[PDB]
Amino acid sequence: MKVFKRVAGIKDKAAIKTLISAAYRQIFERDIAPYIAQNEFSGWESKLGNGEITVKEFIEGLGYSNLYLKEFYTPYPNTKVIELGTKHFLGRAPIDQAEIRKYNQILATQGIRAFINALVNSQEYNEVFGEDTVPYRRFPTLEHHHHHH
């Protein structure tokens, strides 16, 4: 039940970097070594800790990192990048085969930066995991809304 989000008062670079380490294990899936994280994102981390950027813009920027894409995109088929990508941001599986075709089409035409940006600008993300909250896995529960047809 360890909930990682930005509290209005966290100016601490240590607590910020723990929020960032959690965001790695959400998006990149792997636990990233802090000495690697300061070689890759030490310049991007300073904006989050001092407050020049939001948590949404930081995390969307982690989704743009070619380290993540080297692992879960460049050796992976585009459709598998959709389900694992949405799992890491929305915490959901893709809705229909047509939903898959749209994320697949955006990634094919624009590219990977537009694909992550589509998952993060999905209305479910901003209303639940907004510009303060980290996208944690949404429990094995998930079952809502399903009424009598």
PDB file of C-alpha atoms in Angstrom:
ATOM      1  CA  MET A   1       0.000   0.000   0.000  1.00  0.00           C
ATOM      2  CA  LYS A   2       3.094   2.300  -0.479  1.00  0.00           C
ATOM      3  CA  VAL A   3       1.411   5.143  -2.509  1.00  0.00           C
ATOM      4  CA  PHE A   4       3.959   7.248  -4.501  1.00  0.00           C
ATOM      5  CA  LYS A   5       2.592  10.741  -5.377  1.00  0.00           C
ATOM      6  CA  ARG A   6       3.792  14.378  -5.001  1.00  0.00           C
ATOM      7  CA  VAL A   7       2.724  15.977  -1.666  1.00  0.00           C
ATOM      8  CA  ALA A   8       2.436  19.848  -1.619  1.00  0.00           C
ATOM      9  CA  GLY A   9       5.563  20.286   0.579  1.00  0.00           C
ATOM     10  CA  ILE A  10       8.135  17.690  -0.752  1.00  0.00           C
ATOM     11  CA  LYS A  11      11.170  19.928  -1.566  1.00  0.00           C
ATOM     12  CA  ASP A  12      13.410  16.960  -0.464  1.00  0.00           C
ATOM     13  CA  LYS A  13      15.640  15.608  -3.333  1.00  0.00           C
ATOM     14  CA  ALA A  14      15.936  12.222  -1.482  1.00  0.00           C
ATOM     15  CA  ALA A  15      12.097  11.674  -1.343  1.00  0.00           C
ATOM     16  CA  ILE A  16      11.795  12.990  -4.972  1.00  0.00           C
ATOM     17  CA  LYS A  17      14.478  10.470  -6.179  1.00  0.00           C
ATOM     18  CA  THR A  18      12.604   7.585  -4.346  1.00  0.00           C
ATOM     19  CA  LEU A  19       9.378   8.678  -6.221  1.00  0.00           C
ATOM     20  CA  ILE A  20      11.517   8.546  -9.448  1.00  0.00           C
ATOM     21  CA  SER A  21      12.981   5.046  -8.581  1.00  0.00           C
ATOM     22  CA  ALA A  22       9.377   3.761  -8.142  1.00  0.00           C
ATOM     23  CA  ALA A  23       8.432   5.355 -11.538  1.00  0.00           C
ATOM     24  CA  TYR A  24      11.309   3.275 -13.120  1.00  0.00           C
ATOM     25  CA  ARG A  25       9.861  -0.007 -11.651  1.00  0.00           C
ATOM     26  CA  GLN A  26       6.410   1.062 -13.042  1.00  0.00           C
ATOM     27  CA  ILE A  27       7.466   2.101 -16.630  1.00  0.00           C
ATOM     28  CA  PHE A  28      10.904   0.415 -17.272  1.00  0.00           C
ATOM     29  CA  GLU A  29       9.661  -2.540 -15.034  1.00  0.00           C
ATOM     30  CA  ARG A  30      13.328  -3.101 -13.897  1.00  0.00           C
ATOM     31  CA  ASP A  31      14.767  -1.603 -10.698  1.00  0.00           C
ATOM     32  CA  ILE A  32      17.340   0.899 -12.143  1.00  0.00           C
ATOM     33  CA  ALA A  33      20.669   1.305 -10.265  1.00  0.00           C
ATOM     34  CA  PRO A  34      20.889   4.946  -8.745  1.00  0.00           C
ATOM     35  CA  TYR A  35      24.412   5.451 -10.310  1.00  0.00           C
ATOM     36  CA  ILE A  36      22.872   4.730 -13.794  1.00  0.00           C
ATOM     37  CA  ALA A  37      19.847   6.996 -12.952  1.00  0.00           C
ATOM     38  CA  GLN A  38      22.236   9.952 -12.169  1.00  0.00           C
ATOM     39  CA  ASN A  39      24.059   9.337 -15.546  1.00  0.00           C
ATOM     40  CA  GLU A  40      20.706   9.307 -17.488  1.00  0.00           C
ATOM     41  CA  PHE A  41      18.144  11.533 -15.631  1.00  0.00           C
ATOM     42  CA  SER A  42      20.193  13.743 -13.100  1.00  0.00           C
ATOM     43  CA  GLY A  43      19.446  16.817 -15.283  1.00  0.00           C
ATOM     44  CA  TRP A  44      15.728  15.841 -15.666  1.00  0.00           C
ATOM     45  CA  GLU A  45      15.414  14.980 -11.886  1.00  0.00           C
ATOM     46  CA  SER A  46      16.513  18.526 -10.845  1.00  0.00           C
ATOM     47  CA  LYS A  47      13.392  20.002 -12.614  1.00  0.00           C
ATOM     48  CA  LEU A  48      11.059  17.653 -10.586  1.00  0.00           C
ATOM     49  CA  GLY A  49      12.782  18.267  -7.189  1.00  0.00           C
ATOM     50  CA  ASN A  50      12.897  22.093  -7.573  1.00  0.00           C
ATOM     51  CA  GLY A  51       9.439  22.148  -9.323  1.00  0.00           C
ATOM     52  CA  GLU A  52      10.186  23.471 -12.912  1.00  0.00           C
ATOM     53  CA  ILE A  53       8.184  20.452 -14.346  1.00  0.00           C
ATOM     54  CA  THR A  54       5.196  18.304 -13.216  1.00  0.00           C
ATOM     55  CA  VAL A  55       5.211  14.561 -12.286  1.00  0.00           C
ATOM     56  CA  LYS A  56       3.114  13.805 -15.491  1.00  0.00           C
ATOM     57  CA  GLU A  57       5.725  15.567 -17.747  1.00  0.00           C
ATOM     58  CA  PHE A  58       8.619  13.779 -15.907  1.00  0.00           C
ATOM     59  CA  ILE A  59       6.966  10.302 -16.278  1.00  0.00           C
ATOM     60  CA  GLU A  60       5.916  10.914 -19.943  1.00  0.00           C
ATOM     61  CA  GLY A  61       9.646  11.861 -20.457  1.00  0.00           C
ATOM     62  CA  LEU A  62      10.690   8.477 -18.855  1.00  0.00           C
ATOM     63  CA  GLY A  63       8.425   6.796 -21.473  1.00  0.00           C
ATOM     64  CA  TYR A  64      10.467   8.689 -24.186  1.00  0.00           C
ATOM     65  CA  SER A  65      13.802   7.233 -22.779  1.00  0.00           C
ATOM     66  CA  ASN A  66      15.509   4.945 -25.395  1.00  0.00           C
ATOM     67  CA  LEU A  67      16.646   2.718 -22.398  1.00  0.00           C
ATOM     68  CA  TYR A  68      12.934   1.674 -21.861  1.00  0.00           C
ATOM     69  CA  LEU A  69      12.369   1.259 -25.642  1.00  0.00           C
ATOM     70  CA  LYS A  70      15.608  -0.807 -26.144  1.00  0.00           C
ATOM     71  CA  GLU A  71      14.099  -3.375 -23.692  1.00  0.00           C
ATOM     72  CA  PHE A  72      10.274  -3.288 -24.491  1.00  0.00           C
ATOM     73  CA  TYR A  73       9.929  -1.951 -28.134  1.00  0.00           C
ATOM     74  CA  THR A  74      12.966  -2.450 -30.471  1.00  0.00           C
ATOM     75  CA  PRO A  75      13.069  -6.370 -29.949  1.00  0.00           C
ATOM     76  CA  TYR A  76       9.192  -6.431 -29.399  1.00  0.00           C
ATOM     77  CA  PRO A  77       6.252  -6.408 -31.991  1.00  0.00           C
ATOM     78  CA  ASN A  78       4.241  -3.076 -32.013  1.00  0.00           C
ATOM     79  CA  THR A  79       1.017  -4.790 -30.653  1.00  0.00           C
ATOM     80  CA  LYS A  80       2.962  -6.198 -27.581  1.00  0.00           C
ATOM     81  CA  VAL A  81       4.383  -2.651 -26.936  1.00  0.00           C
ATOM     82  CA  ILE A  82       0.697  -1.476 -26.744  1.00  0.00           C
ATOM     83  CA  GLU A  83      -0.451  -3.926 -23.956  1.00  0.00           C
ATOM     84  CA  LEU A  84       2.831  -3.612 -21.891  1.00  0.00           C
ATOM     85  CA  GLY A  85       2.890   0.204 -22.466  1.00  0.00           C
ATOM     86  CA  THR A  86      -0.754   0.702 -21.304  1.00  0.00           C
ATOM     87  CA  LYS A  87      -0.051  -1.700 -18.340  1.00  0.00           C
ATOM     88  CA  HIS A  88       2.844   0.617 -17.226  1.00  0.00           C
ATOM     89  CA  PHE A  89       0.840   3.958 -17.623  1.00  0.00           C
ATOM     90  CA  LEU A  90      -2.993   3.284 -17.414  1.00  0.00           C
ATOM     91  CA  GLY A  91      -2.656  -0.046 -15.474  1.00  0.00           C
ATOM     92  CA  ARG A  92      -5.280  -1.437 -17.957  1.00  0.00           C
ATOM     93  CA  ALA A  93      -5.279  -4.005 -20.835  1.00  0.00           C
ATOM     94  CA  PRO A  94      -6.227  -2.655 -24.425  1.00  0.00           C
ATOM     95  CA  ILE A  95     -10.061  -2.269 -24.906  1.00  0.00           C
ATOM     96  CA  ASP A  96     -10.824  -3.757 -28.406  1.00  0.00           C
ATOM     97  CA  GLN A  97      -8.793  -4.918 -31.493  1.00  0.00           C
ATOM     98  CA  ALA A  98      -9.740  -1.478 -33.032  1.00  0.00           C
ATOM     99  CA  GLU A  99      -8.263   0.259 -29.891  1.00  0.00           C
ATOM    100  CA  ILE A 100      -5.028  -1.731 -30.586  1.00  0.00           C
ATOM    101  CA  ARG A 101      -5.139  -0.601 -34.303  1.00  0.00           C
ATOM    102  CA  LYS A 102      -5.253   3.122 -33.243  1.00  0.00           C
ATOM    103  CA  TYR A 103      -2.200   2.981 -30.825  1.00  0.00           C
ATOM    104  CA  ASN A 104      -0.431   0.782 -33.479  1.00  0.00           C
ATOM    105  CA  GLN A 105      -1.242   3.384 -36.234  1.00  0.00           C
ATOM    106  CA  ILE A 106      -0.007   6.428 -34.146  1.00  0.00           C
ATOM    107  CA  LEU A 107       3.257   4.573 -33.293  1.00  0.00           C
ATOM    108  CA  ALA A 108       3.674   3.516 -36.993  1.00  0.00           C
ATOM    109  CA  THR A 109       3.085   7.036 -38.481  1.00  0.00           C
ATOM    110  CA  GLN A 110       4.261   9.624 -35.822  1.00  0.00           C
ATOM    111  CA  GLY A 111       6.469   7.380 -33.594  1.00  0.00           C
ATOM    112  CA  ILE A 112       7.058   6.210 -29.995  1.00  0.00           C
ATOM    113  CA  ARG A 113       6.934   9.746 -28.379  1.00  0.00           C
ATOM    114  CA  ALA A 114       3.336  10.179 -29.721  1.00  0.00           C
ATOM    115  CA  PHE A 115       2.413   6.612 -28.511  1.00  0.00           C
ATOM    116  CA  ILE A 116       3.419   7.298 -24.808  1.00  0.00           C
ATOM    117  CA  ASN A 117       1.864  10.845 -25.126  1.00  0.00           C
ATOM    118  CA  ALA A 118      -1.470   9.171 -26.248  1.00  0.00           C
ATOM    119  CA  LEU A 119      -1.479   6.823 -23.142  1.00  0.00           C
ATOM    120  CA  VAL A 120      -0.623   9.764 -20.770  1.00  0.00           C
ATOM    121  CA  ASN A 121      -3.189  12.171 -22.422  1.00  0.00           C
ATOM    122  CA  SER A 122      -5.831   9.368 -22.193  1.00  0.00           C
ATOM    123  CA  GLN A 123      -8.613  10.874 -19.930  1.00  0.00           C
ATOM    124  CA  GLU A 124      -8.344   7.920 -17.438  1.00  0.00           C
ATOM    125  CA  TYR A 125      -4.623   8.795 -16.743  1.00  0.00           C
ATOM    126  CA  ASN A 126      -5.027  12.583 -16.059  1.00  0.00           C
ATOM    127  CA  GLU A 127      -8.234  12.189 -13.874  1.00  0.00           C
ATOM    128  CA  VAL A 128      -6.698   9.258 -11.758  1.00  0.00           C
ATOM    129  CA  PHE A 129      -2.813   9.390 -12.091  1.00  0.00           C
ATOM    130  CA  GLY A 130      -2.603  13.192 -12.766  1.00  0.00           C
ATOM    131  CA  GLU A 131       0.426  15.619 -12.825  1.00  0.00           C
ATOM    132  CA  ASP A 132       1.270  14.631  -9.178  1.00  0.00           C
ATOM    133  CA  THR A 133       0.533  10.819  -8.922  1.00  0.00           C
ATOM    134  CA  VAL A 134       2.837   7.952 -10.161  1.00  0.00           C
ATOM    135  CA  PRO A 135       1.039   5.197 -12.334  1.00  0.00           C
ATOM    136  CA  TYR A 136       1.150   2.220  -9.878  1.00  0.00           C
ATOM    137  CA  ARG A 137      -0.345  -1.225 -10.846  1.00  0.00           C
ATOM    138  CA  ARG A 138      -4.123  -0.896 -10.040  1.00  0.00           C
ATOM    139  CA  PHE A 139      -4.470  -4.160  -7.937  1.00  0.00           C
ATOM    140  CA  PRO A 140      -5.847  -7.623  -9.242  1.00  0.00           C
ATOM    141  CA  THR A 141      -9.398  -6.127  -8.600  1.00  0.00           C
ATOM    142  CA  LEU A 142     -10.120  -3.871 -11.749  1.00  0.00           C
ATOM    143  CA  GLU A 143     -13.866  -4.958 -12.101  1.00  0.00           C
ATOM    144  CA  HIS A 144     -16.145  -1.827 -12.352  1.00  0.00           C
ATOM    145  CA  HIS A 145     -19.196  -0.473 -14.350  1.00  0.00           C
ATOM    146  CA  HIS A 146     -20.393  -3.913 -15.768  1.00  0.00           C
ATOM    147  CA  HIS A 147     -24.270  -3.705 -15.567  1.00  0.00           C
ATOM    148  CA  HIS A 148     -27.145  -5.815 -17.047  1.00  0.00           C
ATOM    149  CA  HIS A 149     -27.238  -5.563 -20.909  1.00  0.00           C
TER     150      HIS A 149
END
